[PDB]
């Protein structure tokens with residue numbers, strides 16, 4: 001009958017999901033094995049992440065804006081222990097996805113791309129993909145004017161040593177040669193000057209600027225992507241409930 005979850009967590013669950021004594025909402029929430037605790041809109045963490053979202057909304061993604069409706073702290077049991085805390089270049093990075101995938105993601109954590117690949121391969125191999133531009137990830141939410149509420153995931157990502165690459169390459173994991181991740185280089189990115197620290201992870205705050213990068217061969221990426229090939233380089237921390245405002 002009556003739910004034991006904060007109302008904000010209730011509405012989150014209604015969104016990504018769907019007589020016991022347990023409310024069916026509380027059932028779904030319990031079966032995620034994932035803490036989701038709402039944060040106060042005046043707290044520092046809300047302010048910083050709110051800024052992260054807005055300042056790293058890409059200039060060439062002007063076909064919409066985003067509003068932060070609700071902010072959540074994510075704590076997946078076991079992830080802190082498994083995490084590669086040893087590695088340097090630990091960044092708080094964006095991950096966007098279809099609505100149908102959030103139960104899976106909150107239930108098992110982020111997985112590397114499925115082993116039965118498409119026949120071309122993945123753009124940068126079988127890993128877990130992140131962005132430092134909020135709107136680059138949000139375009140992976142496949143939101144619409146009707147379905148204009150989506151989620152963005154913020155995660156601590158142990159990048160360690162990056163293998164920097166100018167173009168797409170399915171064999172990227174192989175090209176690592178001992179380094180701990182791939183970084184696909186974009187024409188534009190946040191620069192270290194405006195960077196900030198939140199609980200031991202660098203947060204690459206905007207604005208983005210030209211990186212002077214050009215691919216001498218073909219097409220060069222608009223914005224960076226970061227790829228790690230072991231889930232223990234990932235630790236979920238925040239879940240943003242975000243509103244997409246499409247123009248005209």
Ligand SMILES: Nc1ncnc2c1ncn2[C@@H]1O[C@H](C(=O)N2CCN(CC(=O)Nc3cccc4c3CNC4=O)CC2)[C@@H](O)[C@H]1O
Pocket residue numbers: 094095096097098101102103104105106108109110111112113114122128129130131136137138140225226
């Ligand atoms: N446990 C899980 N349950 C359900 N879905 C899960 C899951 N773990 C990952 N996923 C989802 O699988 C999907 C996946 O592997 N894919 C599809 C996407 N593809 C390329 C890719 O990741 N591009 C890409 C590039 C840059 C940034 C971002 C992405 C995706 N999200 C971003 O913010 C790589 C293979 C992905 O959309 C992820 O959200």
